[PDB]
Structure 1
Amino acid sequence: QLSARLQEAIGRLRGRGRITEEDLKATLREIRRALMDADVNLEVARDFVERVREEALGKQVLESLTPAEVILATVYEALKEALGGEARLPVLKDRNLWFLVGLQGSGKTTTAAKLALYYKGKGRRPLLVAADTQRPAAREQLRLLGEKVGVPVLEVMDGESPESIRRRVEEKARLEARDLILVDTAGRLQIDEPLMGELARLKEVLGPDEVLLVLDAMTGQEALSVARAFDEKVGVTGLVLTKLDGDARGGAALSARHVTGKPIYFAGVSEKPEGLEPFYPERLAGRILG
């Protein structure tokens, strides 16, 4: 079930005997470059091999009889702890205000229809808000996906102030008694300042609890520049990894938690609103290495 690069790196150590300190550095350089082909940054891949190096000398891999079964077991348990550990779900209060931010073509409008059906069958009442005004037919896209699940959508006008949006959200959540509020924002870059200063103002007036970042699985080396800019200026408290249906590995989730320190919650496996399952750090541990 392993990849091409990790089938020879762990496979050559079988039936040789006891290893030295120079063999550990020769195996860890292969795991460092196996991550770069699985779409992870070079600065995160260098900080990962220095963590496993200190844990290998503590478990004694030099005096062990089987070296291949120890190194493969240390990377499997270190990657599981670096992604989250176990399957953890967000804390549900009396009034929840969630935010869905991301890049262009990541699928923010697709993830907004998935969270509106998963909590509807448990006992919570959802509510959809569309803050996307720059993209044509974006307010019509969430209206068609909101009629499929049965959740009412709130449409925001062109050129509206952040103080006037809060006046309509607190009015509809009192009469119809809605607890879960889902805000869908527009697609913006990390270096663009006029759009990032408007997002920081929208966070100050409303006051959310859980801010989710929708990141794609096909994101390359630029996965560190997005997670650092959205944490210092705005404030990310959660991560979502969409589009895991193709031949993508999904290594962009490792470069996002190393700089922030915040856990990953949900994962998307299909384009349909029914396709949503919790994040398992055991399933992705055999996909990046496989």
Structure 2
Amino acid sequence: MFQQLSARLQEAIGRLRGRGRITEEDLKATLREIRRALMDADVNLEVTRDFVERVREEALGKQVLESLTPAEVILATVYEALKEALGGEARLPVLKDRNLWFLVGLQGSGKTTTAAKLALYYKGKGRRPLLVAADTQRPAAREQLRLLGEKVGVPVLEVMDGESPESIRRRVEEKARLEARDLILVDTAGRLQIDEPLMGELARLKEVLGPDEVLLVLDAMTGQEALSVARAFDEKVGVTGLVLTKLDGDARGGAALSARHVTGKPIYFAGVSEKPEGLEPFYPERLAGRILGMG
């Protein structure tokens, strides 16, 4: 992901390198090339404009028009902007004594496999996870998580068809008690498109279970519709953090890049492969460095 954008940003910066001091017109041309490139990666006009303005301001503050190496000033400011556009420092959910997190999103987003990968990740960090297959309408969706839980060595409770949220609560509580589970990961129903009633039932499930986190899983190979999925889930259910899956895929990446800005929710993890350990904590500073060719 981001290959084309990466190449283009590195080219724009490299074009300045070794040619000494630049003029204001030269700087304008470079900022244009950056803003346009972002565009061509399908970043929305606002994220592009704001990003380039940030860079212009910070570069001018660093006396880019006095520098004999403006390329390095532009590199540093694009890096620092790009790192904060993605979240700044790395964040992860606050682990307290007994946690309950929803995973929400579309079918095909990576949501169900992410639930199992999270369980594995946190089991390795000493937590005691429980997976909950919460689709009350589609047994096949629950069976998928059951198998994945088996794969990662984490117990799975399956809800029953049509089970009330109160009953789900009661059964999850019981199992968590008996098995000393301290991280409960609820894989909620996924559909290929936003399903309004589901969204109603999901909001209700949230009222009854009271999750500490609601993690929206988005496929980073998709476009701006990912952020309108994000708005729909956030308005109606209320979301606390993002997981971006399939960062290993080929795609423009503009919607993924902006997700942190459009949604105002931290990216906690990113999926980087189809393997059980393809999941890892998201580090803005690391993705920014990659995109700019710094390893």
TM value normalised by structure 2: 0.88
> Does residue 71 of the first structure (1) align with residue 78 of the second (2)?
no
Using a 3 Å threshold, how does the CA distance of structure 1 residues 188 and 90 change in structure 2: closer, same or farther?
Answer: same
Are the counterparts in 2 of residues 239 and 265 from structure 1 also a CA contact under 8 Å?
A: yes
> Does residue 82 of the first structure (1) align with residue 85 of the second (2)?
yes
Using a 3 Å threshold, how does the CA distance of structure 1 residues 43 and 226 change in structure 2: closer, same or farther?
Answer: farther
Where structure 1 has 5 or more consecutive residues not aligned to the other structure, the ranges are none
Using a 3 Å threshold, how does the CA distance of structure 1 residues 82 and 8 change in structure 2: closer, same or farther?
Answer: closer
In the TM superposition, residue 130 of structure 1 has moved relative to its aligned partner by 0.7
Using a 3 Å threshold, how does the CA distance of structure 1 residues 147 and 13 change in structure 2: closer, same or farther?
Answer: closer
Counterpart Cα distance in 2 of 1:109 and 1:42:
33
In the TM superposition, residue 191 of structure 1 has moved relative to its aligned partner by 5.6
Aligned to 2:195: 192
In the TM superposition, residue 37 of structure 1 has moved relative to its aligned partner by 3.8
Are the counterparts in 2 of residues 38 and 288 from structure 1 also a CA contact under 8 Å?
A: no
Using a 3 Å threshold, how does the CA distance of structure 1 residues 111 and 2 change in structure 2: closer, same or farther?
Answer: closer
Bigger mean CA deviation after superposition, 123-132 or 247-256:
247-256
Counterpart Cα distance in 2 of 1:116 and 1:168:
19
In the TM superposition, residue 288 of structure 1 has moved relative to its aligned partner by 4.0
Counterpart Cα distance in 2 of 1:8 and 1:147:
47
Bigger mean CA deviation after superposition, 266-275 or 55-64:
266-275
Counterpart Cα distance in 1 of 2:271 and 2:143:
22
Query: Which protein has the bigger helix share?
Result: 2
Where structure 2 has 5 or more consecutive residues not aligned to the other structure, the ranges are none
Counterpart Cα distance in 1 of 2:151 and 2:43:
36
Counterpart Cα distance in 2 of 1:190 and 1:21:
47
Counterpart Cα distance in 1 of 2:5 and 2:203:
43
Are the counterparts in 2 of residues 99 and 184 from structure 1 also a CA contact under 8 Å?
A: yes
> Does residue 262 of the first structure (1) align with residue 273 of the second (2)?
no
- Residue 216 of structure 2 aligns to a residue whose secondary structure is strand
Using a 3 Å threshold, how does the CA distance of structure 1 residues 98 and 17 change in structure 2: closer, same or farther?
Answer: same
In the TM superposition, residue 135 of structure 1 has moved relative to its aligned partner by 4.5
In the TM superposition, residue 192 of structure 1 has moved relative to its aligned partner by 4.3
In the TM superposition, residue 33 of structure 1 has moved relative to its aligned partner by 2.6
Are the counterparts in 2 of residues 87 and 280 from structure 1 also a CA contact under 8 Å?
A: yes
Counterpart Cα distance in 2 of 1:252 and 1:135:
30
In the TM superposition, residue 190 of structure 1 has moved relative to its aligned partner by 7.0
Are the counterparts in 2 of residues 190 and 230 from structure 1 also a CA contact under 8 Å?
A: no
Flag as ranges the 4+ runs of structure 1 deviating above 6 A.
none
TM value normalised by structure 1: 0.89
In the TM superposition, residue 260 of structure 1 has moved relative to its aligned partner by 3.1
In the TM superposition, residue 217 of structure 1 has moved relative to its aligned partner by 1.8
Aligned to 2:278: 275
Are the counterparts in 2 of residues 103 and 187 from structure 1 also a CA contact under 8 Å?
A: yes
Using a 3 Å threshold, how does the CA distance of structure 1 residues 137 and 83 change in structure 2: closer, same or farther?
Answer: same
Aligned to 1:123: 126
In the TM superposition, residue 7 of structure 1 has moved relative to its aligned partner by 4.3
In the TM superposition, residue 179 of structure 1 has moved relative to its aligned partner by 0.9
What is the CA RMSD across the aligned residues, in angstroms? 2.5
Residue deviations 1:135-159 (CA, integer Å, cap 9, x gap): 5621211111112222221111222
Bigger mean CA deviation after superposition, 152-161 or 246-255:
246-255
Counterpart Cα distance in 1 of 2:261 and 2:10:
27
Are the counterparts in 1 of residues 270 and 282 from structure 2 also a CA contact under 8 Å?
A: yes
Residue deviations 1:217-264 (CA, integer Å, cap 9, x gap): 211132332222222222221111111333346443332211332221
Bigger mean CA deviation after superposition, 77-86 or 209-218:
77-86
Counterpart Cα distance in 1 of 2:148 and 2:251:
26
Matched pairs, number: 290
In the TM superposition, residue 278 of structure 1 has moved relative to its aligned partner by 1.9
Counterpart Cα distance in 1 of 2:7 and 2:127:
46
Counterpart Cα distance in 2 of 1:26 and 1:246:
31
In the TM superposition, residue 189 of structure 1 has moved relative to its aligned partner by 6.6
